[PDB]
Amino acid sequence: SPEQADLVAKLKNGHLSERVLAANKLRFAVVDFPLNPVHAIWHAAKDMIHPENPDNARQASWELLIECVKYPNSTELERSEYFHTLTGPAHSKDFCYQLVALEQLTNHGRNIAGFYYEMFPLLTLWLNQAYRAARDARKLALARPASPEDKNLSQLFALVKDVIKFNFKFATDDVIAGLIDMLLKICMLTSVEDDLRACIHVIESLVTFGSIPTNKLKYCIQVLSSIHCLVPSLQKEAWHTISIICRSHHGQSTVRILLDFLRSYSPNPDKNREKDTVRDVRGALSVLQKLLRKTAEKGYPQVPLSLLVGGLANVSKSSSTRVATEILRLINSLFHGNINPILVEEHWEPIFDVAAQCATKAPTVAKENVSLQLKHLILRVENLIVHQGPELLQRDDCMKFLIRVQH
Numbered sequence: 001s002p003e004q005a006d007l008v009a010k011l012k013n014g015h016l017s018e019r020v021l022a023a024n025k026l027r028f029a030v031v032d033f034p035l036n037p038v039h040a041i042w043h044a045a046k047d048m049i050h051p052e053n054p055d056n057a058r059q060a061s062w063e064l065l066i067e068c069v070k071y072p073n074s075t076e077l078e079r080s081e082y083f084h085t086l087t088g089p090a091h092s093k094d095f096c097y098q099l100v101a102l103e104q105l106t107n108h109g110r111n112i113a114g115f116y117y118e119m120f121p122l123l124t125l126w127l128n129q130a131y132r133a134a135r136d137a138r139k140l141a142l143a144r145p146a147s148p149e150d151k152n153l154s155q156l157f158a159l160v161k162d163v164i165k166f167n168f169k170f171a172t173d174d175v176i177a178g179l180i181d182m183l184l185k186i187c188m189l190t191s192v193e194d195d196l197r198a199c200i201h202v203i204e205s206l207v208t209f210g211s212i213p214t215n216k217l218k219y220c221i222q223v224l225s226s227i228h229c230l231v232p233s234l235q236k237e238a239w240h241t242i243s244i245i246c247r248s249h250h251g252q253s254t255v256r257i258l259l260d261f262l263r264s265y266s267p268n269p270d271k272n273r274e275k276d277t278v279r280d281v282r283g284a285l286s287v288l289q290k291l292l293r294k295t296a297e298k299g300y301p302q303v304p305l306s307l308l309v310g311g312l313a314n315v316s317k318s319s320s321t322r323v324a325t326e327i328l329r330l331i332n333s334l335f336h337g338n339i340n341p342i343l344v345e346e347h348w349e350p351i352f353d354v355a356a357q358c359a360t361k362a363p364t365v366a367k368e369n370v371s372l373q374l375k376h377l378i379l380r381v382e383n384l385i386v387h388q389g390p391e392l393l394q395r396d397d398c399m400k401f402l403i404r405v406q407h
Helices: 002-013 016-032 039-051 053-071 078-087 092-106 119-143 146-170 173-188 192-210 216-228 232-245 250-265 271-293 305-316 319-335 349-357 370-391 396-404
Strands: none
Touching: 002 016, 002 039, 002 146, 016 039, 016 053, 039 053, 039 078, 039 370, 053 092, 078 092, 078 349, 092 119, 092 146, 119 146, 119 173, 146 192, 173 192, 173 216, 192 216, 192 232, 216 232, 216 250, 216 271, 250 271, 250 305, 271 305, 271 319, 271 349, 305 319, 319 349, 319 370, 349 396, 370 396
């Protein structure tokens, strides 16, 4: 357009205040002529984004650049130049614009041609930045609705999820290692549940559309097993993600890891450790109880009874009410859920001995959790004897157990 011709001249050559106004008008012009070439407009304006400029000029330029990247038929070399312009040194206050620019440049993560190999390291960088800035806002909120920093962080998580979905092949193994670490950090220290929901979805994405490297698995399982247990409002979300992982090549490794939380365990004099590992143990129980209802056909890995029980013994010593209650709740889901296949061909004394250990955790005037699970198990073990009888292999182990627990 001859009008657009003018504006660009002023955008390139005007005194700064003229450039700002041109920027604003072009932003309107571009909107009204999307098919028109934004390339020279880009170059005219890109310097105005520099952090040395005042707000009004960076801002009006960002808005113009944002409209420009939308242009459909950019070349790849042109997309590359936009990415480096929009992603590099920029004012802390402008992150929202960068986010949106990148989002629009990529079409919500779909197209990263021109910066195939730069995209993921950039996202990982921005995660650190974005999270850091949300946490601070939230600290100074507690000190002195969602903050702009909260909103920025959500939108970035959404972007990271989408880039994984559409373009995980351009993620190298080592950037993913980086990305995973960053998400788990945020998982274990964030005041906002939505960040956790968001990080779970990022991990879901990884597993759904790419892969978690073997050496990260323990940590994903740690973190997810913990959220699963400790953050009840996200239990379904975490289980979904854990299920995917379980039904995958990691299945075997995941079971092994989950048991390790039990088998690895060792009662530590340092209560920061004792709890660090207990944290892990309670989650493993939660996830195991859920896993153990699954079948090879459903695609889920089986668990060794011997190992499981080996793991369960260690744990039953420590702890009190709620943990003993969990140990039991697991065992109760094994005997009723029909008996679980894992224990049909098997000696039940070992398990019954653990069960009992959880029973260690509990004048006519003077008469004034775990207990809930025992009444559940007794009833079930009682029923198994009654309904099977001689056909039930393990009946004598059943019987010895009930004698322990009555008394």
